[PDB]
Ligand binder design. Structure first.
Ligand SMILES: O=C(O)c1nc(=O)[nH]c2c1CCCC2
Length: 160
């Protein structure tokens, strides 16, 4: 019985068998959130570069870090941006399946400084759902805002 859950906490303190890093295509560490993923799994950033709309797994010991590069909507068109966001989540599902993990910690891609200053909770979450709905892994979504936690919780509830 694989479930969706949401937790308002630092993804770097996840209790899942792998994590998804909200990554840049340069495989570079970044600030804010990514700075805490880097600090907890720094050697996961060795050759972690992957193009926009792709995912790449780097092992930190035996702990898989899935570098998922959602589009920067500042740079992309709404329609291509949407295409790239869907693709990234699809590659995450592929990686989660290939790794054979029973659970994954995943943020909402392209909802922070890649959002183009827009609210993409529903857009990002629905693409997450489309991709992960075909996997048998428990999915734990990580956010920081209070409301977002609630809106994500409700969206999970009203599919079951
Ligand atoms: O806006 C986001 O949450 C986001 N989604 C990504 O897929 N990648 C990255 C970010 C922000 C930090 C830089 C990399």
């Amino acid at each position: 019985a694989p479930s969706y859950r949401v937790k308002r906490m630092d993804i770097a303190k996840n209790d899942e068998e792998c994590v998804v890093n909200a990554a840049n295509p340069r495989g570079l560490p970044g600030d804010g959130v990514c700075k805490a993923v880097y600090k907890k799994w720094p050697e996961s950033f060795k050759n972690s570069a992957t193009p926009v709309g792709t995912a790449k797994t780097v092992m930190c010991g035996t702990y898989p870090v899935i570098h998922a590069v959602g589009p920067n909507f500042s740079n992309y068109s709404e329609s291509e941006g949407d295409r790239e966001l869907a693709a990234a989540y699809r590659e995450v599902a592929k990686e989660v399946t290939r790794l054979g993990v029973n659970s994954v910690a995943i943020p909402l891609l392209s909802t922070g400084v890649y959002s183009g200053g827009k609210d993409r909770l529903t857009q990002s979450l629905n693409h997450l759902f489309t991709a992960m709905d075909s996997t048998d892994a428990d999915v734990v979504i990580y956010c920081r805002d209070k409301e977002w936690e609630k809106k994500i919780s409700e969206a999970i509830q009203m599919r079951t």
